[PDB]
Write an enzyme that holds these catalytic residues in place. Sequence first.
Site, PDB file in Angstrom:
ATOM      1  N   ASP B  35       0.724  -1.110  -0.083  1.00  0.00           N
ATOM      2  CA  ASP B  35      -0.186  -0.034   0.195  1.00  0.00           C
ATOM      3  C   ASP B  35       0.786   1.142   0.042  1.00  0.00           C
ATOM      4  O   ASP B  35       2.134   1.168  -0.261  1.00  0.00           O
ATOM      5  CB  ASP B  35      -1.083  -0.008   1.095  1.00  0.00           C
ATOM      6  CG  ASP B  35      -0.455   0.329   2.555  1.00  0.00           C
ATOM      7  OD1 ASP B  35       0.904   0.493   2.648  1.00  0.00           O
ATOM      8  OD2 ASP B  35      -0.895   0.012   3.759  1.00  0.00           O
TER       9      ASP B  35
HETATM   10  C1  LIG Z   1     -15.415   4.437   3.121  1.00  0.00           C
HETATM   11  C2  LIG Z   1     -15.119   5.405   4.127  1.00  0.00           C
HETATM   12  O1  LIG Z   1     -15.383   5.275   5.408  1.00  0.00           O
HETATM   13  N1  LIG Z   1     -13.883   6.578   3.846  1.00  0.00           N
HETATM   14  C3  LIG Z   1     -13.282   7.346   4.886  1.00  0.00           C
HETATM   15  C4  LIG Z   1     -12.446   6.784   5.731  1.00  0.00           C
HETATM   16  N2  LIG Z   1     -11.382   6.213   5.022  1.00  0.00           N
HETATM   17  C5  LIG Z   1     -11.288   4.707   4.919  1.00  0.00           C
HETATM   18  O2  LIG Z   1     -11.861   4.048   5.562  1.00  0.00           O
HETATM   19  C6  LIG Z   1      -9.884   4.317   4.105  1.00  0.00           C
HETATM   20  C7  LIG Z   1      -8.784   4.462   5.004  1.00  0.00           C
HETATM   21  N3  LIG Z   1      -7.486   4.083   4.731  1.00  0.00           N
HETATM   22  C8  LIG Z   1      -6.670   4.591   3.705  1.00  0.00           C
HETATM   23  O3  LIG Z   1      -6.912   5.634   3.254  1.00  0.00           O
HETATM   24  C9  LIG Z   1      -5.241   3.969   3.082  1.00  0.00           C
HETATM   25  O4  LIG Z   1      -5.466   2.555   3.408  1.00  0.00           O
HETATM   26  C10 LIG Z   1      -4.209   4.607   3.786  1.00  0.00           C
HETATM   27  C11 LIG Z   1      -3.890   4.199   5.240  1.00  0.00           C
HETATM   28  C12 LIG Z   1      -4.226   6.216   3.817  1.00  0.00           C
HETATM   29  C13 LIG Z   1      -2.824   4.203   2.868  1.00  0.00           C
HETATM   30  O5  LIG Z   1      -3.272   5.125   1.923  1.00  0.00           O
HETATM   31  P1  LIG Z   1      -2.449   4.484   0.354  1.00  0.00           P
HETATM   32  O6  LIG Z   1      -2.743   3.089   0.032  1.00  0.00           O
HETATM   33  O7  LIG Z   1      -3.049   5.248  -0.707  1.00  0.00           O
END
Ligand SMILES: *CC(=O)NCCNC(=O)CCNC(=O)[C@H](O)C(C)(C)COP(*)(=O)O
Lengths: 309, 73
Positions: B35
């Site tokens: 990731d």
């Molecule tokens: C669907 C939802 O609730 N959206 C708002 C909250 N965000 C998430 O649930 C996803 C959070 N995770 C990430 O954004 C990425 O996995 C990381 C940790 C920021 C790594 O990012 P990269 O793979 O681009």
Amino acid sequence: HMTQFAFVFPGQGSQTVGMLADMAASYPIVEETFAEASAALGYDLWALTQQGPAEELNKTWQTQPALLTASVALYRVWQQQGGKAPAMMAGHCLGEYSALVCAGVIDFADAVRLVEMRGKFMQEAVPEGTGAMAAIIGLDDASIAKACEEAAEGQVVSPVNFNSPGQVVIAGHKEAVERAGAACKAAGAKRALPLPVSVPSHCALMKPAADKLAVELAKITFNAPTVPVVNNVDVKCETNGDAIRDALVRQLYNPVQWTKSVEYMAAQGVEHLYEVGPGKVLTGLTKRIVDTLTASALNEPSAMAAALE
Amino acid sequence: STIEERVKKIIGEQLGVKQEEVTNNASFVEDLGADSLDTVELVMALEEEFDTEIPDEEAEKITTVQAAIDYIN
Ligand SMILES: *CC(=O)NCCNC(=O)CCNC(=O)[C@H](O)C(C)(C)COP(*)(=O)O
């Protein structure tokens, strides 16, 4: 008919200023789709996505129709160039609306208006600057729940997104989120990363917003899906209008089961996930959930071409 | 151990992957399962072993095993 694939759709946090600029330059249908959204919204959505600033793109009642429209435009590129329908679909949070449009459940312009209202209800329930979401990396689920319980201090904070083994998103009041993240790090978490979202989705603070969303969803026609859609709250493929409506209502204030959703698709024989939206967030999660799955994104023209061949 | 072998080992260490899977054409995300947090750590770990300081304008171009090999030269 060799490799079975699914389409997955990302949610809030995946938007960036300038997203889909290369795709739009190759495929006029991208900007034709944004012109339909723009007419329903009363402003030029394409210009907002391309010029920003990020402060405007990040306001949730604009974030949500921008992301929905981006995902529907990519699906229309796929189909226009002869791509065949996926075996199933799953949308992550706001992405569930994009999956429902692409499956034929909700009319596109209806959905555009619907998610603009959803953002307004959410912001109403938790005003600008008062809520937060954070991704806790590398900490067991017992510890995060303990960190959250002890950090509440008369406020709300809880785990809301089970994104993979080793990634759980928490959300609630801003100060409570900070205290829970600090305690998570103090308990052995690798990171406590704040996320670019303007409201804390899927926590109990959204319950009054879900009551208003139930009334708006009742005013909209739902059709039977032409492609199975796995929902976030129950990990179920519903077909009836009332079942789908209820799962959207409950999604707003209950946990998103993304790990179990991807497990379910793999168990049904899906071998590859294509991410139909900007960014690579869902792609980066896939192998940590099921090691034998592969995944890639369909938001650049070169990736689109290679997948269609 | 040449530059290419040292770049390949680090990628395998950082990403938790067998050396035979770290082929020259693999991309970190779609093939080796990284990731965006893992890639930032992988770039840091490359700066450590080869004592270079990769400016983050061109760290963002280092998306495959060969792109990393070519940058370290
Ligand atoms: C669907 C939802 O609730 N959206 C708002 C909250 N965000 C998430 O649930 C996803 C959070 N995770 C990430 O954004 C990425 O996995 C990381 C940790 C920021 C790594 O990012 P990269 O793979 O681009």
